[PDB]
Amino acid sequence: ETRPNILVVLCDDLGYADVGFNGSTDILTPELDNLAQNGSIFTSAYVAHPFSGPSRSAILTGRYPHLTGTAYNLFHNSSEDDKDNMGVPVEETYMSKVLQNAGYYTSAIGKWHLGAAPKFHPNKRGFDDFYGFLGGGHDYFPSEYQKTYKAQKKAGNPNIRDYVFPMEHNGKPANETEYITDGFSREAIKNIKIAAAKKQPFFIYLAYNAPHVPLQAKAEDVAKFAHIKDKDRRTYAAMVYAVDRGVGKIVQTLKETKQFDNTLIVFLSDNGGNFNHGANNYPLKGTKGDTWEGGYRVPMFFHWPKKIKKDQRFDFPVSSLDLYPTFTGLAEAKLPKGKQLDGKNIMDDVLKNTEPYKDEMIYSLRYREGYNDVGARMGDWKITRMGNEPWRLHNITQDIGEKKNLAGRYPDRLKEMIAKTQEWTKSFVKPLWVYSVKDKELWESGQMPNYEATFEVDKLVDSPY
Numbered sequence: 370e371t372r373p374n375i376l377v378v379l380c381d382d383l384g385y386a387d388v389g390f391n392g393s394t395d396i397l398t399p400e401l402d403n404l405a406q407n408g409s410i411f412t413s414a415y416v417a418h419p420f421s422g423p424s425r426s427a428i429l430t431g432r433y434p435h436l437t438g439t440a441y442n443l444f445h446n447s448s449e450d451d452k453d454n455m456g457v458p459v460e461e462t463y464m465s466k467v468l469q470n471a472g473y474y475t476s477a478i479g480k481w482h483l484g485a486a487p488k489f490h491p492n493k494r495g496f497d498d499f500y501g502f503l504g505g506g507h508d509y510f511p512s513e514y515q516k517t518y519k520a521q522k523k524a525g526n527p528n529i530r531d532y533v534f535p536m537e538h539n540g541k542p543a544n545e546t547e548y549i550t551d552g553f554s555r556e557a558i559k560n561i562k563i564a565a566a567k568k569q570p571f572f573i574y575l576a577y578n579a580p581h582v583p584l585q586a587k588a589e590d591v592a593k594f595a596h597i598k599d600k601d602r603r604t605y606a607a608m609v610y611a612v613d614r615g616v617g618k619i620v621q622t623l624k625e626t627k628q629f630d631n632t633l634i635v636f637l638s639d640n641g642g643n644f645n646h647g648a649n650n651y652p653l654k655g656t657k658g659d660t661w662e663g664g665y666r667v668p669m670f671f672h673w674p675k676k677i678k679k680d681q682r683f684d685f686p687v688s689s690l691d692l693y694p695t696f697t698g699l700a701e702a703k704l705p706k707g708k709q710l711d712g713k714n715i716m717d718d719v720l721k722n723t724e725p726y727k728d729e730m731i732y733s734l735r736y737r738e739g740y741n742d743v744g745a746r747m748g749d750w751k752i753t754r755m756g757n758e759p760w761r762l763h764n765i766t767q768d769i770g771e772k773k774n775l776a777g778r779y780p781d782r783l784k785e786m787i788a789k790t791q792e793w794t795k796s797f798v799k800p801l802w803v804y805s806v807k808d809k810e811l812w813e814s815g816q817m818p819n820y821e822a823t824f825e826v827d828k829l830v831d832s833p834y
């Protein structure tokens with residue numbers, strides 16, 4: 370039929386300069402590069418939050434996490450009891466469910482991080498099939514983590530880390546035997562073949578945990594980078610390379626089943642690279658978690674041979690929030706009544722090279738221990754507050770590294786963008802959970818969120834003398 374298949378390939382903590390098509394000089398990603406070159410590379414792509422849980426929530430709900438109560442990560446080994454509601458609210462309908470109701474065969478593979486209790490399970494949230502783990506990460510070698518899991522059960526460990534838990538397949542044990550990146554690639558191939566056999570459009574949410582810690586890589590991938598002297602960089606490159614291998618096999622499967630031409634492949638990272646653990650975000654400033662560009666500006670391409678031209682670069686800013694309305698539009702799917710969305714259906718803009726966010730803002734706000742980091746972009750201009758320092762105004766097109774603070778030269782533009790961003794925060798909800806005890810103390814006493822203090826300007830720079 371006319372409706373395209375959709376494959377999201379979502380990496381975890383992949384740095385900005387860590388794929389070939391986005392600038393890498395040491396990591397080799399020929400299969401991803403080939404896809405990017407045969408479609409549209411997005412040079413100003415943003416995720417809705419600079420860390421996983423809230424970013425993933427935003428991709429699947431189509432709303433900023435500040436509107437859904439999900440702006441902090443779930444903790445390690447979060448409650449698996451429905452009564453504790455440790456998960457994204459069930460009332461916020463996921464794009465997977467919408468696609469499933471419109472006749473797609475739907476599959477999620479890899480990392481979830483959206484709730485470990487039954488009501489939050491992928492199979493309850495629109496996925497016909499799920500293969501992966503429910504929490505925030507996982508050790509990569511089954512021979513290693515299955516030994517550790519059994520050994521800790523035998524020792525009577527009452528709090529085994531979910532990183533070594535057996536993975537699952539629709540709620541049954543997975544009995545994985547491969548390096549799990551290779552396993553996730555295998556399950557993607559299989560689900561592509563199932564969709565081909567059913568003669569049904571597919572939506573596959575392939576959430577590799579690579580290159581997220583722990584840095585663990587196959588010897589055969591390491592040898593591709595054996596000369597790289599920094600052991601972290603060497604292992605990380607091999608981890609990314611393994612994803613690239615899997616994408617190459619997925620691509621051959623799509624061609625063999627004749628689904629390649631009419632499949633939209635979207636590749637991105639859930640957030641910026643963590644430069645403490647192998648990642649490189651050049652030329653951006655900062656690291657995973659920041660509201661510098663480095664925390665939430667990510668590599669992205671769209672690949673869809675039927676519609677998207679080759680060698681395209683799309684330079685206008687876009688959001689991972691656009692995936693929900695764009696995909697449901699492509700699926701000719703009807704949104705549930707009352708569903709709220711923060712992004713736009715951008716596919717016509719990509720095809721015509723027009724500006725979807727013209728005179729509109731793409732935002733980040735990240736909660737810290739007593740203050741807020743903020744970023745906000747319109748057109749060529751961005752405002753940033755990091756570490757509760759004085760506000761910065763950057764021409765992000767001219768100054769991608771956020772080095773030249775123009776707040777003094779153009780104070781009206783600064784204040785203009787502040788006012789719009791402060792108005793945005795008036796729609797926020799309270800978090801359903803926070804992350805640390807410190808967090809809970811600050812919110813309970815009203816020290817957080819204090820958006821009013823976040824949007825102070827002149828008193829941060831004026832001298833009292």
Ligand SMILES: O=S(=O)(O)O[C@@H]1[C@H](O[C@H]2O[C@@H]3CO[C@H]([C@H]2O)[C@H]3O[C@@H]2O[C@H](CO)[C@H](O)[C@H](O[C@H]3O[C@@H]4CO[C@@H]([C@H]4O)[C@H]3O)[C@H]2O)[C@@H](O)[C@H](O)O[C@@H]1CO
Nearest residue numbers: 420421441442445504505506507530581582583657658804
């Ligand atoms: O690894 S060891 O040093 O041996 O200790 C481990 C374990 O420590 C790890 O926990 C996580 C897995 O690797 C890193 C180690 O510190 C951690 O990475 C974290 O993964 C999370 C997802 O599972 C998140 O990505 C997390 O990042 C977040 O951190 C906070 C919360 O939200 C923001 C930020 O505010 C986000 O960036 C990331 O750091 C240790 O916990 C355990 O005690 O011992 C193990 C060894 O047995």
Ligand SMILES: [Br-]
Nearest residue numbers: 462463466494
């Ligand atoms: Br749902």
Ligand SMILES: [Br-]
Nearest residue numbers: 535536544545
């Ligand atoms: Br397993």
Ligand SMILES: [Br-]
Nearest residue numbers: 643644645646
């Ligand atoms: Br860290």
Ligand SMILES: [Ca+2]
Nearest residue numbers: 381382421639
């Ligand atoms: Ca991440």
Ligand SMILES: [Cl-]
Nearest residue numbers: 521528529530
């Ligand atoms: Cl453990």
Ligand SMILES: [Cl-]
Nearest residue numbers: 627628629630
């Ligand atoms: Cl084809």
Ligand SMILES: [Cl-]
Nearest residue numbers: 643644645656
């Ligand atoms: Cl740091």
Ligand SMILES: [Cl-]
Nearest residue numbers: 675676677678
């Ligand atoms: Cl064409």
Ligand SMILES: [Cl-]
Nearest residue numbers: 654755771772
């Ligand atoms: Cl700085």
Ligand SMILES: [Cl-]
Nearest residue numbers: 779780781782
């Ligand atoms: Cl001005």
Ligand SMILES: [Cl-]
Nearest residue numbers: 800802803812
């Ligand atoms: Cl709270």
Ligand SMILES: [Cl-]
Nearest residue numbers: 825826827828
């Ligand atoms: Cl002020």
